[PDB]
């Protein structure tokens, strides 16, 4: 068995840990056991990520850091990592005595070869040589990079904490705790604070006792920074196994042959991690009896699938409000449709949770785009949950549920990414929510839907101006030429004169856009793709005696968009339609079973139609 | 320096060898040397690809098959591959005498492990074991699959020729040609023909002399068919090394673990080959003097960038006519503008080209979709030249010139997929070219630009009705609200009353759509993206004393389309605009130097404006 421990904190390092994990997994032979010293947010994200990865012969265990933040709090730090840099100092207190030797990797490492070869070095230590480390490739500790430099004392050039190799389960038998605490206290009275966090103190702990360390080969930790001489430490491609990026620039580091290093960085990150799979047994014995001859075999197989979800891709933050009535949009988006994102961002003020569906490479494409555009960065309160690509269908309900569950306000709005709201729709929905008093009853609010057929139009301001455009003829009701029954029962002719909200019942194929509490039912997953992805939720919410209210002054208007293959596959072959109807009626019978007489209504409708 | 031999024949093989070479190259660790025996179309396709791939430490040599077709012409065959399967036995004559041992692989093979391990088996041959094969994993040769089956004689279950391991040196030495020829005729005297082409003759020469074979372990090629028995021939993922998909259904087969095998197949069919990249010296030295402190170094970096081109993705066939006055379109496009292709297919009748610009995964999705639509499939004579993505900019000029160079008719028509000229325009332009007789003079024909914003517009048919709908004014001159000088200088006013074509000189920012002979100049690579792209061609075309002729009776209807990302960057990035201006100055002075006084006019215009 190979064991390893990584400190994780912040969204950036959570991403670094995912890249490191795929790099390591590329060359595995043996079972692996990780230990992530993580805070609350990173733990929440990575638990789900690793629970959905389904990797065999891997066990991942997370150790809280908030409780153990105080252990090093007395040591001031200036490293960009923060207080979490010193967390590499108290692993013995966290990791139980059950283990004997364990790797320790910083989040930025990217393994180029098998980690078993590194694990091999745990039988090459002599006598009291317990700690494994590699010599720093810079001249930071030598005190000669620039005038008036006073680095912490160390032996020779100093050693870098990129890769730590522990062993003997001796650090407890030798009382490491007291000595390191005493060393740290002694090395803080003269100078101000640490410079490299753990790497700053460990070097001193090496100097005061030179014989614990085992001076590994330099070409083990090929540090990449502005003052590296690794060209002596590396000769060819095969002379390279593990690379570090010990600069805040990271991707913007400069070297003589940095091109090959950038290649070696994108060689693992680009890999589609869904091909690394060579809570489970349940999935196998449900997939086992899926009849291939069944007309819905592909759908049945797809429904049970689990896809790699990476919650909170970019930095997120939200200060809760006392009104406890805030709403948050939900949308499903793909890389064929991301251009109008900014349009939507400028038209929403409250928190919004999306759910992307990307393919690794494209995922990164989106990363570069978002890191370029200033509009997304100016806004800190937008989530990004990317459920990576897998299979051939479009599990839209999956992504909608993923955006549903992780939401920081009690209320939510269901819509599509192709639409667009007014200026201040957030505020009006807050007022309407606080007025209709949905805190107790199970009621829903509906925002009417329209569409337009001209790319470059101005954005209306008021209701009168809107109805002016409508009768001018540039706008119509949503789906007024393909699926008329979707919104026709709203009979906007009635709404035009409306001044207070009014309630409506359900009509055939009646698919509005709802604002609802966080307890609303999850979308039924058997249906994936395009078509009948919303109406099922509507009939679910209706059989549960949820009333509908249609807001008089709110509206939302569709922006033209090109078609995708989902609608084409919805119009291609009759088998897809037959399977769709099959699942429809299946849902009706089972829904009746769980509720009964109330469901007969819908059944009668199909008899009438 | 492993040596491989692949038979290529037909467009399907041309597209399978890409995935096979991808698979082999993914796990490479030592230099490789291919030998592709191909006909004219496959030779051109594969020559063009590798030459563009720029893979290092890999050598590729192509051997003609037309000259060597006759060798096996006397052997009737029934395999779907064709007569090229039998050609697998003439390799001794075709391959050079300086080689010793070669791995002969069919197109369908996929390598799960490095071919170095397979090559290593050439250190385990003893006695007179000169061939290397594996036992067939089917019951074809056993004569028991069904009633009235008479397989050719073989040793036991038989052998599958998917993978052949040879020792050229010997087979030459010990008289291989004559004995396989003698066996070939000896086994064809009684009955009609073979059942598996080369897989039959090899089996025959395996049976007659059992001392040449070497019974490799079963797991060197896991044959998958409708009656496979490979379940006992593997236990885990690691053991598997190579898979043969011997079935006309290919990916539609059914097996116990067909899902995992299909996932592996899709792993490399969708892998990003632009990562696999790890003529060269010259490109590097051009990149040498490039300065990163320059105003527009990004443009210089992109000017000579080489992109992977896979010409003629799908079947293509076209017989030139005796008139020698045909015209073919050219137009760039990507994902976002695919659906228009059908409309143009319903408009044009003769051959077209399109420099489709997508990644690998998007290319595969397009392949499936185009294999779905009946209209696309039924049209044989439409090329599809695909250039994969790399870098950040949009090398529109590169796409258009890749479409330019490879055209199978004398004259050509330059446009974008954003236009949809009339119905029957093919014969009209044929007669126009015939009558104006460009075959001798140097002239450029022009068809009418325009623009509309009505997606559901009945398609016009005749000039007078356009006169009417301009009188009522449904659609306006193309780009009448952003760039008036783009097409207003054509003075559409006089077009209406004209009945014969009229000639026009050059004006500022005149960017029409032209028809011209193949000889027309290539584009300047310096301009990549949107903006000041076609005017370069128009000015260069004009200075070569090409008379601009405007056809009286033709016309085009711009189909409204969504905004792209390049235009957004151009409108947002001022540095882009300034770099456009400096590129214009550079091009103007290069124009001056390469032609002299005649090009001063542009400079004067730049001074006047
Ligand atoms: Mn670091
Ligand atoms: Mn739509
Ligand atoms: Mn085959
Ligand atoms: Mn356009």
UniProtKB/Swiss-Prot annotation, chains A, B:
Pathway the protein takes part in: Protein modification; protein glycosylation
Positions annotated to bind Mn(2+) 1: 106, 108
Organ and tissue specificity: Ubiquitous. Highest expression in heart, brain and skeletal muscle.
Membrane topology label: Single-pass type II membrane protein
Cellular component GO terms, alphabetical: Golgi apparatus; Golgi membrane; neuromuscular junction; plasma membrane; protein-containing complex
Cofactor (UniProt): Mn(2+)
Subcellular location: Golgi apparatus membrane
Location (main, coarse): Golgi
Glycosites: 12, 136
Keywords: Coiled coil, Congenital muscular dystrophy, Disease variant, Dystroglycanopathy, Glycoprotein, Glycosyltransferase, Golgi apparatus, Lissencephaly, Manganese, Membrane, Metal-binding, Multifunctional enzyme, Signal-anchor, Transferase, Transmembrane, Transmembrane helix
pH effects: Optimum pH is 5 for xylosyltransferase activity. Optimum pH is from 5.5 to 8.0 for Beta-1,3-glucuronyltransferase activity.
Topological domains, Lumenal: 1-609
Positions of region (Xylosyltransferase activity): 2-277
GO molecular function terms listed in the Swiss-Prot or TrEMBL record: acetylglucosaminyltransferase activity; glucuronosyltransferase activity; glycosyltransferase activity; hexosyltransferase activity; manganese ion binding; UDP-xylosyltransferase activity; xylosyltransferase activity
Subunit structure: Interacts with DAG1 (via the N-terminal domain of alpha-DAG1); the interaction increases binding of DAG1 to laminin. Interacts with B4GAT1.
Family: In the C-terminal section; belongs to the glycosyltransferase 49 family. In the N-terminal section; belongs to the glycosyltransferase 8 family.
Name listed for the protein in its UniProt record: Xylosyl- and glucuronyltransferase LARGE1
Lineage: Eukaryota, Metazoa, Chordata, Craniata, Vertebrata
Full protein segment contained here: 137 to 756 of 756
């Amino acid at each position: 068995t190979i064991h390893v421990a990584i400190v994780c904190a912040g969204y950036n390092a959570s991403r670094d840990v995912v890249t490191l994990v795929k790099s390591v997994l590329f060359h595995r032979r043996n079972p692996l056991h990780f230990h992530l010293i993580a805070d609350s947010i990173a733990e929440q994200i990575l638990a789900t990520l690793f629970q959905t990865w389904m990797v065999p012969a891997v066990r991942v265990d997370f150790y809280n850091a908030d409780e153990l933040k105080s252990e090093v709090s007395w040591i001031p730090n200036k490293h960009y990592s923060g207080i979490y840099g010193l967390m590499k100092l108290v692993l013995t207190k966290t990791l139980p005595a059950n283990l004997e030797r364990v790797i320790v990797l910083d989040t930025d490492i990217t393994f180029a070869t098998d980690i078993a070869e590194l694990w091999a070095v745990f039988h090459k230590f002599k006598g009291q040589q317990v700690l494994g480390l590699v010599e720093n490739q810079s001249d930071w500790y030598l005190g000669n990079l620039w005038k008036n430099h006073r680095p912490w004392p160390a032996l020779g050039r100093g050693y870098n904490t990129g890769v730590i190799l522990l062993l003997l389960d001796k650090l407890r038998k030798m009382k490491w705790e007291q000595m390191w605490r005493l060393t740290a206290e002694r090395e803080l009275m003269g100078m101000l604070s640490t410079s490299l966090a753990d790497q700053d103190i460990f070097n001193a702990v090496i100097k005061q006792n030179p014989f614990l360390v085992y001076q590994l080969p330099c070409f083990w930790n090929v540090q990449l920074s502005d003052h590296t001489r690794s060209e002596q430490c590396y000769r060819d491609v095969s002379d390279l196994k593990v690379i570090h990026w010990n600069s805040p620039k990271k991707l913007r580091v400069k070297n003589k042959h940095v091109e090959f290093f950038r290649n070696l960085y994108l060689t693992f990150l680009e890999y589609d991690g869904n091909l690394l799979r060579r809570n489970s047994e349940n999935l196998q014995k449900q997939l086992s009896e899926l009849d291939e001859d069944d007309l819905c075999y592909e759908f049945r197989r797809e429904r049970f699938t689990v896809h790699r979800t990476h919650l909170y891709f970019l930095h997120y933050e939200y200060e809760p409000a006392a009104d406890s009535t805030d709403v948050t949009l939900v949308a499903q988006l793909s890389m064929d449709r991301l251009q109008m994102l900014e349009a939507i961002c400028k038209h929403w003020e409250g928190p919004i949770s999306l759910a992307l569906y990307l393919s690794d490479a494209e995922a990164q494409q989106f990363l570069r785009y978002a890191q370029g555009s200033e509009v997304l960065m100016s806004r800190h309160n937008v989530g990004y949950h990317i459920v990576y690509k897998e299979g051939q269908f479009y599990p839209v309900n999956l992504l909608r549920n993923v955006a549903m569950k992780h939401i920081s306000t009690p209320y939510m709005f269901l819509s599509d990414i192709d639409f667009l709201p007014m200026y201040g729709l957030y505020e009006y929905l807050r007022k309407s929510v606080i007025q209709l008093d949905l805190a107790n009853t199970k009621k829903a609010m509906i925002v009417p839907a329209f569409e337009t057929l001209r790319y470059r139009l101005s954005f209306p301001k008021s209701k009168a101006e809107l109805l002016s455009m409508l009768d001018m003829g540039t706008l119509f009701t949503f789906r007024y030429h393909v699926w008329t029954k979707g919104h026709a029962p709203t009979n906007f002719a009635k709404w035009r004169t409306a001044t207070t909200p009014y309630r409506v019942e359900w009509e055939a194929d009646f698919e509005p856009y709802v604002v609802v509490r966080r307890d609303c039912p999850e979308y039924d997953r058997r249906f994936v793709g395009f078509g009948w992805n919303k109406v099922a939720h509507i009939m679910e919410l209706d059989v549960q005696e949820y009333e509908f209210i249609v807001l008089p002054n709110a509206y939302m208007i569709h922006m033209p968009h090109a078609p995708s293959f989902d609608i084409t596959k919805f119009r291609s072959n009759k088998q897809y339609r037959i399977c769709l109807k099959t699942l429809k009626e299946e849902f009706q019978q089972d829904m009746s079973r769980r509720y009964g007489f109330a469901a007969l209504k819908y059944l009668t409708a199909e008899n009438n139609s």
